[PDB]
Amino acid sequence: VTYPAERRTFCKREGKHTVHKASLYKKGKDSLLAQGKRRYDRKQRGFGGQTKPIFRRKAKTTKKQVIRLTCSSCKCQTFQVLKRCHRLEISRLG
Amino acid sequence: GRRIRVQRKGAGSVFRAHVARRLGAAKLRANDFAERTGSVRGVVKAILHD
Amino acid sequence: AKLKNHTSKNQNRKDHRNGIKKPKKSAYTSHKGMCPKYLRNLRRSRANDPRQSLRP
Amino acid sequence: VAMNPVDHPHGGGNHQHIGVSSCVPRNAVPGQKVGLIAARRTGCSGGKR
RNA sequence: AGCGGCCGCCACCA
RNA sequence: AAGACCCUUUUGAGCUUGACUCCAGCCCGGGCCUGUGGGGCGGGGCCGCCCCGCUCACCCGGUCGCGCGGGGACCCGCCCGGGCGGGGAGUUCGGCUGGGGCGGCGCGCCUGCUACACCGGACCGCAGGCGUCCCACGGCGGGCUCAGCGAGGACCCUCCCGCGGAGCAGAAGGGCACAAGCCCGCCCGACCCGCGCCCCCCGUGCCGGCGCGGGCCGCGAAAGCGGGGCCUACCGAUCCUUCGCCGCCCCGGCCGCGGGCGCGGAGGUGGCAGAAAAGUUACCACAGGGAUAACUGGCUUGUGGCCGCCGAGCGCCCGCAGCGACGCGGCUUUUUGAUCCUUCGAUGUCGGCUCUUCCUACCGUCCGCGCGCACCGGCGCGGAAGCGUCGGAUUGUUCACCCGUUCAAGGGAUCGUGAGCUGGGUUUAGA
RNA sequence: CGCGAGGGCCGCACCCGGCGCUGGCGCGACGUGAUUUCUGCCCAGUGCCAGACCGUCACCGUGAAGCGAUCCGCCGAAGCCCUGGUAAACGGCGGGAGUAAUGACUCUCUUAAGGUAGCCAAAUGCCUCGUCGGGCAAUUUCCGACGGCAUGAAUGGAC
RNA sequence: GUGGGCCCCUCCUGGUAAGCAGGACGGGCGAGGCGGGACGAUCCGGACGCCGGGCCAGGGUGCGCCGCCGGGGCCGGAACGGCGUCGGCCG
RNA sequence: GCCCGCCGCGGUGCUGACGCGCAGAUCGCUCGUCGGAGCCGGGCAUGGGGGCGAAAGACUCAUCGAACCGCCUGGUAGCUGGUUGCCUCCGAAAUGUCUCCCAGGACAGCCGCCGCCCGCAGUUGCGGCCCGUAGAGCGCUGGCCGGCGG
RNA sequence: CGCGCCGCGGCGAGCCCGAGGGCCCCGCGGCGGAGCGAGCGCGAGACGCCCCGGGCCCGCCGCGCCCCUGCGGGCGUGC
Ligand SMILES: [K+]
Ligand SMILES: [K+]
Ligand SMILES: [K+]
Ligand SMILES: [K+]
Ligand SMILES: [K+]
Ligand SMILES: [K+]
Ligand SMILES: [K+]
Ligand SMILES: [K+]
Ligand SMILES: [K+]
Ligand SMILES: [K+]
Ligand SMILES: [K+]
Ligand SMILES: [K+]
Ligand SMILES: [K+]
Ligand SMILES: [K+]
Ligand SMILES: [K+]
Ligand SMILES: [K+]
Ligand SMILES: [K+]
Ligand SMILES: [K+]
Ligand SMILES: [K+]
Ligand SMILES: [K+]
Ligand SMILES: [K+]
Ligand SMILES: [K+]
Ligand SMILES: [K+]
Ligand SMILES: [K+]
Ligand SMILES: [K+]
Ligand SMILES: [K+]
Ligand SMILES: [K+]
Ligand SMILES: [K+]
Ligand SMILES: [K+]
Ligand SMILES: [K+]
Ligand SMILES: [K+]
Ligand SMILES: [K+]
Ligand SMILES: [K+]
Ligand SMILES: [K+]
Ligand SMILES: [K+]
Ligand SMILES: [K+]
Ligand SMILES: [K+]
Ligand SMILES: [K+]
Ligand SMILES: [K+]
Ligand SMILES: [K+]
Ligand SMILES: [K+]
Ligand SMILES: [K+]
Ligand SMILES: [K+]
Ligand SMILES: [K+]
Ligand SMILES: [K+]
Ligand SMILES: [K+]
Ligand SMILES: [K+]
Ligand SMILES: [K+]
Ligand SMILES: [K+]
Ligand SMILES: [K+]
Ligand SMILES: [K+]
Ligand SMILES: [K+]
Ligand SMILES: [K+]
Ligand SMILES: [K+]
Ligand SMILES: [K+]
Ligand SMILES: [K+]
Ligand SMILES: [K+]
Ligand SMILES: [K+]
Ligand SMILES: [K+]
Ligand SMILES: [K+]
Ligand SMILES: [K+]
Ligand SMILES: [K+]
Ligand SMILES: [K+]
Ligand SMILES: [K+]
Ligand SMILES: [Mg+2]
Ligand SMILES: [Mg+2]
Ligand SMILES: [Mg+2]
Ligand SMILES: [Mg+2]
Ligand SMILES: [Mg+2]
Ligand SMILES: [Mg+2]
Ligand SMILES: [Mg+2]
Ligand SMILES: [Mg+2]
Ligand SMILES: [Mg+2]
Ligand SMILES: [Mg+2]
Ligand SMILES: [Mg+2]
Ligand SMILES: [Mg+2]
Ligand SMILES: [Mg+2]
Ligand SMILES: [Mg+2]
Ligand SMILES: [Mg+2]
Ligand SMILES: [Mg+2]
Ligand SMILES: [Mg+2]
Ligand SMILES: [Mg+2]
Ligand SMILES: [Mg+2]
Ligand SMILES: [Mg+2]
Ligand SMILES: [Mg+2]
Ligand SMILES: [Mg+2]
Ligand SMILES: [Mg+2]
Ligand SMILES: [Mg+2]
Ligand SMILES: [Mg+2]
Ligand SMILES: [Mg+2]
Ligand SMILES: [Mg+2]
Ligand SMILES: [Mg+2]
Ligand SMILES: [Mg+2]
Ligand SMILES: [Mg+2]
Ligand SMILES: [Mg+2]
Ligand SMILES: [Mg+2]
Ligand SMILES: [Mg+2]
Ligand SMILES: [Mg+2]
Ligand SMILES: [Mg+2]
Ligand SMILES: [Mg+2]
Ligand SMILES: [Mg+2]
Ligand SMILES: [Mg+2]
Ligand SMILES: [Mg+2]
């Protein structure tokens, strides 16, 4: 699957169609101060072993790839999700 | 499991040495003043089985 | 062991025992799903008819 | 190997046999440190001088 | 996912 | 004797380890315990290491403290950190299923058929498919016509006719010709905000589709069409994490960091309405189950066994003395299967020995007929169950195989017969 | 096979203990199982071990930034990784085609190595009541030979 | 409360078949007394308070055992055979 | 740590007796051993996931693949058994969906009771639309025996 | 003991033997009376025997327009 380098589509900030530039979305690194991580660290202190489940039985060999679309005129970000696929590359022209 | 044979010997009871009717612990003569400055004379009394 | 999978043997007799019900008389005239552009004009017309208007 | 598995790490089996290597490491714990402990080599051979 | 140079060693709450 | 075999229960226990999660113990490093001096290396513009004296802490020995030593600021101990760790601890070890297991996966979806012309309709029923692929293989407008037959043309070109016999990503069915196929031009409706219905269905969710109100756009002269790829499959809760708007809260105030919250996507559960999980028991279990196997009996009769009908042929000649292919019609329950109706708070489960009674589908003896019947001896058929059908070698054997004799059929009775025996086999615990 | 005592193996909640009234002709851990005759090949896998500090791998400590919480660097013990050794450690020890009725022979694919000396239808051979011979009137038993479903060398082989 | 069903008639699917296994409209037993089918949860009739009289469904009417006479004929199971007997059709 | 054999110590075969016993392991005959890793008495030591074992998962007071005693404890059971007077009025289901679900449940159906309020039908007739089965057939997608004419 | 529904008694925009103090007398909470919104917070009259539906009003999400004390007020529109 190939995705266009640039695309013209709706912007919410300005309220009309502008040209957006493509990039690939990636999950950022986990903070140490998010409340669920704080709760997990406190539960894991002391004797007793693992206190929460650990997922094993994996089935999918594919994730959903999501495109970041950054507006050229104002820097407003929008996201497009793609159907499941094995390779994705963005074109390179502009 | 249970405790194995080598683990039971450290506790003593039936694995202690059979020391009854032994002559004693065998040692050299203790170093003292006379031996450090000279020599002391002894005489062999018996030769014994331990 | 294995047990039975499926039957509909007694089900038409259970369906008939209390009669076959009918839908409420007011479901035939529910506004749900009609064009909004028609339901807007319907309200506007009545509000300006003195025989029908219910404004204080 | 003449014992049952409850009695010794070498016990059990439908034939009398150890099953794994009888070279055990130097840091094995008590109850586990049987057979040949921390052996540099094994077997019968000449040539030593 | 983490260092290194397909290899190693180490990480693991949907 | 509330089956000990077998199965089920979200009932156990002993044992094992490459199950899951951990604990003692041991090894390693820095710190405190902890003195008092002498030196070397390196870095950065004081910091890090390392080395070696002394004795006074601390530690060890000799001695009846009878005329004495050894180590030493290191070891031990303590605090925190990393590694090894079935020695030990706790727990788990899916489901469906013509019993369970091995195998398979109708466990989430899709097409045609089964299915008996509304809808709906079962099986470990039949023939198959899906976990992907495509910025064009998508949107729109214009133009064009495909597969091919026939007939021509130096060693692809032309005409004519052409209902699709081509093509439309991949299963199957359906759909489509100035098009839904092919080529060209311009594009990104493969968008944003807010609702409703259809299928499945308890009229809950999820996938998928359809119809609308309002923004902003693409193509077209325009009417129009467009929320992907013609239609029927191609996918995912709570909690947590991550990112993107526009804001609100941090509760005695105010400011800056940070944290939380209202909305929407993404990271995944294929056992697909979604626990985090390996084996073994011939040492054994508990609750139950004839809802379910191993043995009698019952229904069935493929397989086994026995019996007819026809007449290609064989039999020097001569289809029927004796035979009889290719085909077709039955019977039996002495084989083995198929099934799971009765029995799991128990019907003692192989054979042999002993003893009795029964069947006829008759092997010898009796009475009749037939012959490819001279005699002798054989062979075929009907009636006939009275008497006879034996002694041994090897095998637990039933069976089989040999030797011998007055020359030696086949079966049933809870696979007759264990409070009649025996205990060789099979069938607990030792090896 | 381990250990020279400031040690090794074991006990034990703690303090404190056993071997030890002991010292390598000793103590402790394992395997095989008198004698006679022997004990072959494989260190690739797993296990064990010693010699090197390559990568990885803690806290502590230290540098740069910050209002501070903190973030990012450097430093780097044992272990693993790497280089070797070891089978009386655990264990393992062959295919196809022709060639004088056989096959000394040859070509061939292949392993870490391709089962040696021996023994055998064995208390180990499925096929199987194997084949031949002894013994019997007659033997799925027996003995002797022959040669491997799945014989074989301290898993100790043969006698 | 129930979420083990089963049988009959017609219509089907796997299987050599089965008192085998799996589906469909309607009815039954389950949870339905009484009579009859010798005998049977389901077949043929008929669906039920306690009695007296009458009529009669289904099945039957030698004796067991409640109830019969008249009239016209004839005298478990397959392929395949029969100058047994009575009746036909074609020549 | 030689051989025959008495007491002693043990326990082979009869698969003998007995098997409601003399007995919760005994009796008869037969048999192993009998100077030694031999047999017997008293005192003392080792304590339960522990001991002790010339090793059988054996023995640890008729208890052992984890003793006995009291308590936690009337431990939990989707599983087996039982669950006590009369008459009257009504009256089922053994099916759909989801479920570590398949000997159990929740929601729907079926039924009871309590109500409350002001045309109807498990039927025929007449009219309009819908279906692709039995039969029939070979045009379509496939399959199949032969005979004439160019 | 807690939760749901039904029946009957007393009083009714109200109701009530808490505990306690002097089968009698006095006796707070509480619940009901207003909802909606994560929260800053804002906040219901228009009809009707009864029941059912329609219409309109309040909050939450969005958006025309006008204005004073102003990211504050007013008047509207839409699921
Ligand atoms: K958070
Ligand atoms: K923990
Ligand atoms: K133990
Ligand atoms: K133990
Ligand atoms: K142990
Ligand atoms: K023990
Ligand atoms: K073993
Ligand atoms: K049982
Ligand atoms: K059982
Ligand atoms: K069973
Ligand atoms: K069992
Ligand atoms: K149970
Ligand atoms: K269990
Ligand atoms: K057990
Ligand atoms: K046990
Ligand atoms: K264990
Ligand atoms: K372990
Ligand atoms: K376990
Ligand atoms: K429904
Ligand atoms: K769908
Ligand atoms: K729209
Ligand atoms: K989620
Ligand atoms: K989120
Ligand atoms: K039981
Ligand atoms: K059962
Ligand atoms: K049953
Ligand atoms: K049954
Ligand atoms: K039959
Ligand atoms: K049965
Ligand atoms: K049976
Ligand atoms: K039984
Ligand atoms: K019985
Ligand atoms: K006869
Ligand atoms: K060895
Ligand atoms: K030895
Ligand atoms: K030898
Ligand atoms: K090796
Ligand atoms: K090596
Ligand atoms: K090695
Ligand atoms: K050989
Ligand atoms: K032999
Ligand atoms: K071998
Ligand atoms: K069959
Ligand atoms: K009925
Ligand atoms: K006739
Ligand atoms: K004696
Ligand atoms: K006797
Ligand atoms: K006795
Ligand atoms: K003697
Ligand atoms: K002890
Ligand atoms: K003790
Ligand atoms: K115990
Ligand atoms: K106990
Ligand atoms: K007790
Ligand atoms: K207690
Ligand atoms: K239970
Ligand atoms: K139970
Ligand atoms: K009971
Ligand atoms: K389970
Ligand atoms: K169920
Ligand atoms: K259950
Ligand atoms: K229920
Ligand atoms: K045709
Ligand atoms: K809000
Ligand atoms: Mg913009
Ligand atoms: Mg009804
Ligand atoms: Mg043993
Ligand atoms: Mg063990
Ligand atoms: Mg039972
Ligand atoms: Mg029992
Ligand atoms: Mg369960
Ligand atoms: Mg268990
Ligand atoms: Mg267990
Ligand atoms: Mg364990
Ligand atoms: Mg199962
Ligand atoms: Mg579409
Ligand atoms: Mg599911
Ligand atoms: Mg055993
Ligand atoms: Mg049964
Ligand atoms: Mg037959
Ligand atoms: Mg059954
Ligand atoms: Mg009995
Ligand atoms: Mg009996
Ligand atoms: Mg019998
Ligand atoms: Mg008897
Ligand atoms: Mg008996
Ligand atoms: Mg045995
Ligand atoms: Mg041995
Ligand atoms: Mg060797
Ligand atoms: Mg061997
Ligand atoms: Mg049946
Ligand atoms: Mg019942
Ligand atoms: Mg009767
Ligand atoms: Mg009479
Ligand atoms: Mg002797
Ligand atoms: Mg003797
Ligand atoms: Mg006896
Ligand atoms: Mg208890
Ligand atoms: Mg109890
Ligand atoms: Mg009634
Ligand atoms: Mg059912
Ligand atoms: Mg689940
Ligand atoms: Mg699940």
Numbering used by the authors:
A (entry chain o): 2 to 95
B (entry chain A): 2 to 51
C (entry chain b): 2 to 57
D (entry chain A): 202 to 250
The authors write:
Giardia lamblia (GL) is an anaerobic parasitic protist, which causes an acute human diarrheal disease called giardiasis and poses significant health and socioeconomic problems in poverty-stricken regions worldwide. As expected, we found that the GL ribosome comprises an extremely reduced version of typical eukaryotic ribosomes, missing nearly all of the eukaryote-specific rRNA expansion segments (ESs). In contrast, the ribosomal proteins are typically eukaryotic with some species-specific insertions/extensions.
Multibody refinement resulted in a slightly improved density map of 2.69 and 2.85 Å for the LSU and the SSU, respectively. Furthermore, the GL LSU has almost no rRNA ESs at the solvent-exposed surface of the subunit and the 5.8S rRNA structure is truncated compared with the human 5.8S rRNA; however, the base pairing with 28S rRNA is conserved. However, two eukaryotic rProteins are absent, i.e. eL6 and eL28, as discussed later. Most notably, the human rProteins eL6 and eL28, which are absent in the GL ribosome, bind and stabilize the extruded region of ES7–ES15 of the human ribosome that is located on the solvated face of the LSU. The GL ribosome contains an extended rProtein eL33 C-terminus compared with the human eL33. In the absence of rProtein eL6, this terminal region interacts directly with the C-terminus of eL32. Moreover, rProtein eL14 C-terminus also shifts to interact with rProtein eL33. The uL4 C-terminus exhibits a striking difference between the GL and human rProteins. In GL, the C-terminus wraps around the solvent-exposed rRNA region at helix H25.
